[PDB]
Amino acid sequence: DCYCRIPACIAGEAAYGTCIYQGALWAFCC
């Protein structure tokens, strides 16, 4: 699964895109 994250993706994940949600840019991490 993937998750929007701030400020970064967790160990084991990489960024594949972005989320925009409650006025901020999130990392989309899978």
Side-chain angles (χ1 to χ4, degrees), residues 7-27:
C9 314
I10 72 177
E13 288 183 335
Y16 296 80
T18 46
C19 320
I20 300 175
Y21 171 48
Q22 31 198 217
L25 232 200
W26 302 70

Side-chain angles (χ1 to χ4, degrees), residues 1-19 25-30:
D1 221 316
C2 311
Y3 306 88
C4 302
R5 299 218 194 261
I6 288 176
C9 314
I10 72 177
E13 288 183 335
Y16 296 80
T18 46
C19 320
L25 232 200
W26 302 70
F28 189 70
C29 307
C30 304

